[PDB]
């Protein structure tokens, strides 16, 4: 069995860039729907004795598309924080100038492939094998971690994530994910 | 240069089952937007000049992903009428009755397919090319036309087409659609 995880901060934490009601919707029903349809597809199977990682990379179909999506959205909660947003500083702001020119250049490219990213999916920053960084897009429930490559910071761009707040502004939700961003988060990522 | 087809009724016509503000974005903003961002791709191509179904058949990539969701949205606004849903009757009761059974067990499988789609897509009633009618979903843009069955209904099941009436509940979304549906339209297809 696998449980929701907390949310790291309060549900209006956010506010006004990602509202206290798509919170209650997007992790309270959701995120915690993928965890019991996971739950119940993998009962008594030998998924059951996998951690959440082993899982997404051995299955195919629906308990890949629930796993994936368990853990896709428990990293990008973190990846998001009260009071943070803003330019990186340290190791993150030199890894992001060393492979994209500057930081200015990196949210510029970030942002066109969220919104050019079509229909339901995810774009992540993901440190390759080779150490460079690089800015990946996925369809669906699909992740970085069937690859070699690490992954850093993640926005969901499935409707559900801005419609209440954006409706079919996407441009408009990226812009208010970069006052969000958890630079911390994406630090220790970076550094493992 | 393809023109937005108006709708074939009030934007609120379809009220409370579908509210007038869902049509004013999915209609007025989201087909709208599919129309634009196709007349920009095709302008000095040879793609313009031909009609929607011959682009349809034969691109892939953004001329494909916007051709096709301008013809999907214009079939799907057909599909749906106010003084209209319940049961067919004629031709296409009978079509169905062979093909499933019956009506009940029809909307059963329609239904569990349109909610078991994952992600962005669409679900459809078919006529194949042995004449039998078959129900089969399409992932984000894709639609029977690039196949050799004729398409006779659908419902889309991108997020944005329920999400401001129903949030997370598809299965509300599609409990409403079978209110809505114009058998009339149905009829015409099947006959074509
Ligand atoms: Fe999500
Ligand atoms: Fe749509």
Request: proline share 4%.
């Amino acid at each position: 069995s696998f449980e929701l995880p907390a949310l790291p901060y309060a549900k209006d934490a956010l506010a006004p860039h990602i509202s206290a009601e798509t919170i209650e919707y997007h992790y309270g029903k959701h995120h915690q729907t993928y965890v019991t349809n996971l739950n119940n597809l993998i009962k008594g199977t030998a998924f059951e004795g996998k951690s959440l990682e082993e899982i997404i990379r051995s299955s195919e179909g629906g308990v890949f598309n629930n796993a994936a999506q368990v853990w896709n959205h428990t990293f990008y909660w973190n990846c998001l924080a009260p009071n943070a947003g803003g330019e990186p500083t340290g190791k993150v702001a030199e890894a992001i100038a060393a492979s994209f020119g500057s930081f200015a250049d990196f949210k510029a490219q970030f942002t066109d492939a969220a919104i050019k990213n079509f229909g339901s999916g995810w774009t992540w920053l993901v440190k390759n094998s080779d150490g460079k960084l690089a800015i990946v897009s996925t369809s669906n429930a699909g992740t970085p971690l069937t690859t070699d490559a690490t992954p850093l910071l993640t926005v969901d761009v499935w409707e559900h994530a801005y419609y209440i707040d954006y409706r079919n502004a996407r441009p408009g939700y990226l812009e208010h994910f970069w006052a969000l961003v958890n630079w911390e988060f994406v630090a220790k990522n970076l550094a493992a």
